[PDB]
Design a protein around this ligand. Structure first.
Ligand SMILES: *[C@@H]1O[C@H](CO)[C@@H](O[C@@H]2O[C@H](CO)[C@@H](O[C@@H]3O[C@H](CO)[C@@H](O)[C@H](O[C@H]4O[C@H](CO)[C@@H](O)[C@H](O)[C@@H]4O)[C@@H]3O)[C@H](O)[C@H]2NC(C)=O)[C@H](O)[C@H]1NC(C)=O
Ligand SMILES: *[C@@H]1O[C@H](CO)[C@@H](O[C@@H]2O[C@H](CO)[C@@H](O[C@@H]3O[C@H](CO)[C@@H](O)[C@H](O)[C@@H]3O)[C@H](O)[C@H]2NC(C)=O)[C@H](O)[C@H]1NC(C)=O
Ligand SMILES: *[C@@H]1O[C@H](CO)[C@@H](O[C@@H]2O[C@H](CO)[C@@H](O)[C@H](O)[C@H]2NC(C)=O)[C@H](O)[C@H]1NC(C)=O
Ligand code: NAG
Ligand code: NAG
Ligand code: NAG
Ligand code: NAG
Ligand code: NAG
Ligand code: NAG
Ligand code: NAG
Ligand code: NAG
Ligand code: NAG
Ligand code: NAG
Ligand code: NAG
Ligand code: NAG
Ligand code: NAG
Ligand code: NAG
Ligand code: NAG
Ligand code: FRU
Ligand code: FRU
Ligand code: MAN
Ligand code: MAN
Ligand code: MAN
Ligand code: MAN
Ligand code: MAN
Lengths: 526, 526
């Protein structure tokens, strides 16, 4: 059986009224439907919201959700739960607008076990959502509380809790700092993150502004102010302001950027005036960090799309638009020359890793790996390359031809051009030394070639040699992680024919180079 | 009849020894050879150097030049002169390395009419070049002087004039401030522009550092610190620090960025912590400003290429690699919401503008313009759109379909895919409101499709409606300028078949919208 390219009418037909108190049933069998990423059972999804872990260890993912269309609008908070951030259970819609002319825009959630809010006289498991209500004339911050573990929310009786009389004032991210609540919120079209403080989540006082930092684009969105541990030393950490911008990103549309710095409970001060882009492709946006994580883990998830084409991608015939990124483990590190770097790695994938397709220690060879018998149409790969120390001390010893080439090739079973669906090319030396290209050839996709914003080629240039590469392919998405997650990219692909194999080639590698390649099929979560 | 795709052996064969005191003869007839842009007669060119206007109105363009190969190396300063920045005369090589193991890297030139240097006891027309000398172990700043108008240079007897014992210290840009010389120079791998002062161009004193601003990439290069007049008010100006970075640009490889701010003769202070990219495509790098211009004119030129593919472009069979951008008139303006903006417009094109190919006032139409009779294979176009007052006040009145689509189509006489060589698509509203796409379809170019770094699609998103668009096509290059040069892009194209025509379509425009389209052929300067 080939995965279907179109579904039954009952799978794709959207209701004319929003379902309340019942799970929306999903057909997750589409040829483009990711099997280890979250996507909504039906309809259009964007930013992750309300991300938190409850005391029982359940991760709550909420999401911007149009239950009525395959385009942006009518925003509700959708809800899915998981104990491992891969095996998702769909839940009833969590937050509804008060009427048909208002929308529940992005926001965050916190546990209030000490009842600072006063909402929780008889429970230590209270959840508070802080979110933007979009009116035709205003964006205001509102509060809603849950006594049932974050499934049903009661709006605060004296909403809204915060307004500045603006229709560009959104995406509150709330967290506890020592003795008070902090809110980071975007004065979106003023390129300002405003910081407010509160003892009880309902009374907010202005603290400070963070304005005109890094790339402006056309708006600041979905600010996250978080403490991120050092990759090489868990006992150390720094504060990080993460800001999403859209439109006006360098590659077009939407992108995330970050600022390492100091936070003292009222003011964030960046360590320098540099701009730093989080992902070197164009399908990673609106990253939100999970509240109430265990063991000083920095855990985030993003929307794996771009505002320039998210409402036009050819998945609506498969009963959805938009998926989340892999869930991410985050660290800070210093990389050679550039210094500060936001590290992103896939959150523990062990619960979805299936049997080995290939284990190889062959250097200067091509490994040809078929996965047509992997029903998920999803694979994980790991490539380690360890140069001899002679080639580290003297890079002039490396051949101009020393390179890595990865290609994802169309299925022989589920066919059509022979073009790869996705390529990665890296050079150790030569005229483009350290250059890594990630491509989705226009030739592989009639839709992609025609969409004016669907960029074919992305690149990042290393200073250090490439020593590790991890990747996940999941039907219509490729994520890559270079040098223990120092550099990462999230890339959508919509090939005319589904991918059925991958080739991993190394060439021109120095004598004594160690190569280790591992490829595993992934098990579907649905 | 058709422009040659391959030239005689004598046209492309490079000498084995560098010619001294003689002009290198060029064949400028190649199907990819620009006819209104500067490119070297033979060999490989990169960054513009020594840019200045002499007292008699001759513009001097020097350039990084490998006379021996079609790749980077063996750097000399090549030299060309013009009175209008379009009609270039090739000159003998201006600056030579002192031996076979050193290279003349980038730098600047200034007039020294008051003989501050002591080089010019008997002339007020003295020119001083300040440039990086590259050795395998060091980058140092050197001085050479010319008494003959900048054709022949004598090295300063006590070179070098500035060393810090670094191998990453280059691209000095020198200018007069009130009572002293200022040098902006890149501590390239430290992401620092160092400012030095001198009474006499030979003795340099450290003044200040400008460090870790905007995008770092992998290196700061070719800093320019210049006073740029306001577009709306010639009597006002602000200081601007322009920095080129490579590699590590968001689109891959090389890009220019800028910082508006204050300069007081010793210290540059940016007005804010924002990063601002100069050009929204990937083929505009190492912009240098002309010294000693007239009438408060800010004039610059850039290298129209990208380091990721400049040494691989398919023009070596046509006796060259690399062209300059159009010469640019620069201003600063405030654009809606985003604020500070570097304006770039083509410098007075009137000396190359040939007869009209089309004048049209038709809205909601497709104009087909054939230019197979324009021997230059170069055209200028101008498109104005004036929306009615009603739609300027209420944009909700604009149709989702309101759009402008320009395509450059392959010649049928000199061919074959029917793919456009280049496209521009802009939307007034709909789901991607204000989004402008500039594309070079992979389908149009076998070389382009295969090159892993030759990105197919670029975009910029407007806030204001598009009201003006100017463009120049020149055989293998397209430059576009949006809303009186508020936004600009430089894009190389290497189509399999030469461009023979363009289509300009408007559609879905509000009742009462005024459209004016002008297209002119350009006259070859060679
Ligand atoms: C913390 O930051 C917030 C967000 O930036 C800030 O609130 C804002 O203040 C600015 C003023 O600095 C407001 O901007 C103005 O809004 C009015 C109404 O639309 C405009 O008429 C003003 O126009 C003039 O000034 C502009 C900027 O120089 C010019 O471009 C223009 O031509 C006019 O001369 C101006 O745009 C803005 O509306 C608010 N935004 C919000 C969301 O409140 C707040 O003041 C900061 N607080 C502290 C303590 O610093
Ligand atoms: C102005 O900026 C320049 C350039 O950044 C400063 O010089 C530089 O100083 C740094 C130290 O901050 C040097 O880094 C160092 O590298 C050497 C060798 O790798 C190492 O031994 C040192 O311990 C240090 O890590 C850098 O090399 C150097 N660069 C250059 C081009 O000289 C300068 O100090 C600044 N001046 C002021 C007043 O701030
Ligand atoms: C762009 O707008 C800014 C902010 O309005 C201008 O900067 C100021 O200009 C006024 C004079 O009109 C000065 O008094 C202020 O001190 C300036 N700075 C600030 C932060 O307000 C700037 O001049 C404008 N630039 C252009 C090119 O128009
Ligand atoms: C809909 O709800 C919004 C937000 O509470 C409010 O501003 C608006 O007046 C409501 N309209 C109606 C008629 O219910
Ligand atoms: C929250 O605290 C503020 C003081 O910051 C107080 O004015 C307000 O009454 C409190 N609200 C509730 C509902 O307890
Ligand atoms: C935090 O730092 C700022 C200066 O950046 C200072 O003004 C403020 O008072 C500090 N707040 C606390 C709680 O110390
Ligand atoms: C990066 O280096 C800087 C300068 O030494 C240091 O202050 C910072 O703690 C380092 N960060 C990490 C993550 O190692
Ligand atoms: C499935 O495919 C893999 C990779 O080609 C192969 O190693 C494995 O033996 C196959 N298994 C079956 C049961 O076909
Ligand atoms: C690398 O080897 C070359 C000779 O092959 C030598 O000239 C050079 O100095 C060496 N470089 C280093 C970093 O040791
Ligand atoms: C590859 O190197 C990584 C470091 O990024 C390490 O965690 C992993 O165990 C190695 N994989 C193997 C041995 O193939
Ligand atoms: C990888 O592909 C590139 C194409 O740019 C090629 O130049 C390089 O030699 C190849 N390396 C391999 C097959 O390992
Ligand atoms: C890989 O090829 C390079 C360059 O030809 C060579 O020096 C090296 O010994 C080769 N290694 C293997 C494992 O064949
Ligand atoms: C070559 O010339 C440069 C610049 O004058 C000088 O620094 C270098 O030492 C010279 N090398 C030799 C081998 O003559
Ligand atoms: C340049 O000026 C410095 C400082 O006054 C002085 O030491 C030096 O002799 C001058 N050099 C020349 C060649 O005039
Ligand atoms: C220039 O400005 C800096 C502050 O940015 C100051 O330290 C210096 O004294 C000023 N120099 C002059 C010549 O005024
Ligand atoms: C467009 O408008 C400008 C306004 O200055 C005018 O100079 C120019 O002639 C017009 N260009 C076209 C499209 O005719
Ligand atoms: C331009 O192209 C877009 C699709 O990219 C299309 O929707 C629009 O209707 C076209 N408009 C014109 C003016 O041809
Ligand atoms: C353009 O076409 C639209 C849709 O048919 C129409 O409403 C509008 O009046 C037309 N405008 C002009 C300027 O012809
Ligand atoms: O994509 C992020 C942006 O879109 C929204 O989520 C609305 O669905 C906003 O709250 C946010 O600024
Ligand atoms: O392209 C810019 C860079 O390349 C050089 O011009 C050398 O040819 C350097 O001077 C500069 O940093
Ligand atoms: C969906 O699309 C595939 C090919 O893309 C067809 O094979 C299938 O029948 C359906 O139309
Ligand atoms: C659900 O959506 C699909 C794709 O548009 C339709 O083909 C189907 O009939 C139903 O409307
Ligand atoms: C369940 O109730 C909610 C209340 O907001 C409605 O929006 C929904 O349509 C359904 O009736
Ligand atoms: C330019 O091309 C000619 C052939 O036309 C060669 O002979 C020459 O060496 C250079 O490559
Ligand atoms: C003319 O002289 C220069 C040195 O000034 C040489 O490099 C060139 O080859 C020719 O002899």
């Amino acid at each position: 059986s080939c995965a279907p390219t179109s579904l039954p009418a009952s799978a794709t037909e959207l209701p004319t009224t929003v379902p309340t108190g019942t799970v929306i049933t999903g057909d997750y069998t589409g040829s483009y439907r990711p099997q280890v990423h979250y996507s909504p059972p039906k309809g259009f999804m964007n930013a992750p919201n309300g991300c938190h872990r409850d005391r029982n260890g359940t991760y709550h993912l909420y999401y911007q959700y149009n239950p009525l269309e395959y385009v942006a609008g009518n925003q509700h908070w959708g809800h899915a739960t998981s104990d491992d951030l891969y095996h998702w259970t769909n839940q009833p819609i969590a937050i509804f607008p008060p009427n048909s002319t208002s929308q529940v825009f992005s926001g965050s959630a916190v546990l209030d076990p000490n009842n600072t809010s006063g909402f929780f006289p008889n429970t230590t498991d209270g959840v508070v959502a802080v979110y933007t209500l979009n009116t035709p004339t205003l964006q205001v911050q509102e509060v809603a509380y849950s006594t049932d573990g974050g499934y049903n929310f009661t709006p605060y009786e004296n909403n809204p809790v915060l307004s500045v009389g603006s229709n560009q004032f959104r995406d509150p991210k709330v967290f506890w700092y020592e003795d008070h609540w902090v809110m980071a919120v975007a004065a979106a079209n003023d390129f300002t993150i405003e910081i407010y403080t509160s003892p009880n989540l309902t009374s907010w006082t202005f603290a400070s502004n963070f304005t005109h930092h890094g790339l402006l684009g056309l708006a600041y969105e979905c600010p996250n102010l978080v403490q991120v541990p050092f990759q090489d030393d868990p006992s150390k950490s720094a504060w990080l302001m993460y800001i999403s911008i859209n439109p006006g990103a360098p590659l077009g549309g939407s992108v995330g950027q970050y600022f390492p710095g100091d936070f003292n409970g009222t003011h964030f001060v960046a360590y320098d005036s540099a701009a730093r882009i989080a992902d070197f492709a164009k399908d990673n946006y609106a990253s939100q960090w999970f509240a109430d994580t265990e063991n000083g883990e920095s855990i985030s998830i993003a929307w794996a799309s771009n505002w320039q084409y998210t409402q036009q991608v050819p998945t609506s015939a498969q009963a959805f638009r938009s998926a989340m990124s892999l869930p991410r483990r985050n660290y800070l590190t210093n990389i050679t020359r550039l210094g500060w770097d936001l590290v992103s790695l896939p959150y523990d994938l062990s619960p979805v890793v299936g049997p080995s397709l290939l284990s190889s220690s062959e250097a200067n060879s091509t490994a040809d790996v078929d996965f047509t018998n992997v029903t998920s149409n999803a694979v994980w790969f790991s490539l380690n390359v360890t140069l001899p120390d002679a080639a580290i001390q003297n890079a002039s010893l490396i051949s101009a031809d020393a390179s890595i080439n990865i290609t994802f090739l169309p299925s022989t079973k589920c066919s059509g051009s022979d073009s790869p669906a996705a390529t990665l090319t890296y050079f150790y030396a030569g005229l483009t030394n350290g250059a890594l290209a990630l491509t989705r050839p226009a030739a592989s996709s009639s839709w992609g070639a025609e969409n004016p914003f669907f960029t074919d080629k992305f690149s990042y240039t290393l200073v250090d040699p490439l020593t590790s590469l991890v990747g996940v392919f999941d039907r219509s998405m490729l994520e890559v992680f270079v040098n223990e997650g120092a550099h990462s990219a999230t890339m959508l692909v919509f090939p005319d024919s589904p991918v059925g194999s991958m080739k991993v080639a190394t060439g021109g590698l120095p004598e004594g180079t160690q190569v280790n390649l591992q490829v595993n099929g992934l098990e579907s979560t649905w």
